[PDB]
Amino acid sequence: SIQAEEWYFGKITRRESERLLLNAENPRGTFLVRESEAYCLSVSDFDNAKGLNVKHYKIRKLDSGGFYITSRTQFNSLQQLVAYYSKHADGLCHRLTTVCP
Amino acid sequence: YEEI
């Protein structure tokens, strides 16, 4: 199920996700998917005026079933959405490089 | 939440 995915962290808070993502070993683009406290994608990123920071994206769910962050691309599962943005940032701050430990 |  989704709970067998190592990138899925359940219903954690934004503060907890930033605490998990932002340590000094996690590379730029480390990420996790969490349930909204429908899902949220949280990604670490670096910029000079901010340093290493987390961006949070809402993953919207269609009534017909698919998921999307931009209307430009939609997916039938969270697994396909994570696969796509691991290959292409395509508007996200950074490509998904590393599953958060 | 960031809008892409």
Curated annotation (Swiss-Prot), chain A:
Q: What does this protein do?
A: Non-receptor protein tyrosine kinase which is activated following engagement of many different classes of cellular receptors including immune response receptors, integrins and other adhesion receptors, receptor protein tyrosine kinases, G protein-coupled receptors as well as cytokine receptors. Participates in signaling pathways that control a diverse spectrum of biological activities including gene transcription, immune response, cell adhesion, cell cycle progression, apoptosis, migration, and transformation.
Q: What else is known?
A: May be involved in blister formation in Pemphigus vulgaris, phosphorylated-SRC is abundant at blister sites but not in normally adherent tissue, which corresponds with loss and disruption of CDH1 in cells adjacent to blisters. Phosphorylated SRC is increasingly abundant at pre-lesional sites of blister formation and occurs prior to changes in abundance of CDH1 and DSG3.
Species assigned in the record: Homo sapiens (Human)
What protein name applies here? Answer: Proto-oncogene tyrosine-protein kinase Src
Q: Which residues carry this modification: Phosphotyrosine?
A: 39
Q: How is the polypeptide modified once translated?
A: The phosphorylated form is termed pp60c-src.
Superkingdom of origin: Eukaryota
Q: Which residues form a coiled coil?
A: none
| Residues shown, of full length | 145 to 249 of 536
Give the SH2 domain ranges: 7-100
What is the protein's quaternary organization?
A: Part of a complex comprised of PTPRA, BCAR1, BCAR3 (via SH2 domain) and SRC; the formation of the complex is dependent on integrin mediated-tyrosine phosphorylation of PTPRA. Interacts with DDEF1/ASAP1; via the SH3 domain. Interacts with CCPG1. Identified in a complex containing FGFR4, NCAM1, CDH2, PLCG1, FRS2, SRC, SHC1, GAP43 and CTTN. Interacts with ERBB2, STAT1 and PNN. Interacts with DDR1, DDR2 and DAB2. Interacts with CDCP1, TGFB1I1 and TOM1L2. Interacts with the cytoplasmic domain of MUC1, phosphorylates it and increases binding of MUC1 with beta-catenin. (Microbial infection) Interacts with HEV ORF3 protein; via the SH3 domain.
- Let me know which tissues express this protein, per UniProt: Expressed ubiquitously. Expressed in the skin (at protein level). Platelets, neurons and osteoclasts express 5-fold to 200-fold higher levels than most other tissues.
